[PDB]
Structures are given as structure tokens and as C-alpha cells.
Design a protein around this nucleic acid. Structure first.
Lengths: 52, 52
DNA sequence: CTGTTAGGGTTAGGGTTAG
DNA sequence: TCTAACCCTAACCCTAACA
């Protein structure tokens, strides 16, 4: 089921990119809580954040 | 302008869903004739067909 | 086979008309 | 007034090219 990205997931993604680096989606996924997301979904959300 | 759906288009759409499955709009659009429609239009028609 | 990421392609679903 | 047809676009998928 399609799930909009919540504020806390967005925060974790940004924290993850600052610490682990842009592109290291799998590593980011392993260090923070996300709502049943895969590393591809993180990559995609990052692209959307840039667009917004 | 606006274009209501003819019985032929509906037949193809339903045949398409059976053969390719619901949600595979672009593949369906590629294998049957439709009145200048996009994959999104097929998806919207299916929704209405379900709502009727 | 399990898993990875970049990037183009596609779909879900709530909102917007046309008539 | 009502609603099927159409729009917007974030979210998600497919594929290449590897490890």
C-alpha cells in the first residue's frame, strides 16, 4: 500500500544523509527507523525532497 | 475535447486486465486499440467501471 | 541467488472540470 | 446539481551493471 512519507521518516533520512552520505541508502536504512521502506524508497524520497 | 468511452474500448480494457492484470495500464495500452488514450485514462476508466 | 544505486518510466489516488 | 472523464505528481517500479 502506498504510504506518504511522514515527518519523522523525513528527519531520519536527512540525519542519515548528513552522517552516512548521499547515495548510501542501504546503510541509512539500517541505522534509523523508517516505516517498512526499502533502500530504493529512500533514494526516491531524496529525489522528491530536492524537487520540493 | 472530452471523450466518453465506447463499448469497444471497454471490451479491450477488460480483455487487457485479464491478460496482463489490473494496474499494468501501460502494457495494456500497448496491446489493444483505444481512442487516443493514455495509460492514466485506462486506469481512471477501470476505477469508474469498478464504481459501476 | 541475494543485494546495491542511478535514473527513466509508471501507477495510485485525491483533486479538478466538462457538459 | 451531479459525476464520468480528466489532471497533478509523490510514491513506487524496472533495469543496467555490477558485487
Amino acid at each position: 500500500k502506498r504510504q506518504a512519507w511522514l515527518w519523522e521518516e523525513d528527519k531520519n533520512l536527512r540525519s542519515g544523509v548528513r552522517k552516512y552520505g548521499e547515495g548510501n541508502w542501504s546503510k541509512i536504512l539500517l541505522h534509523y527507523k523508517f516505516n517498512n521502506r526499502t533502500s530504493v524508497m529512500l533514494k526516491d524520497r531524496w529525489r522528491t525532497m530536492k524537487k520540493l
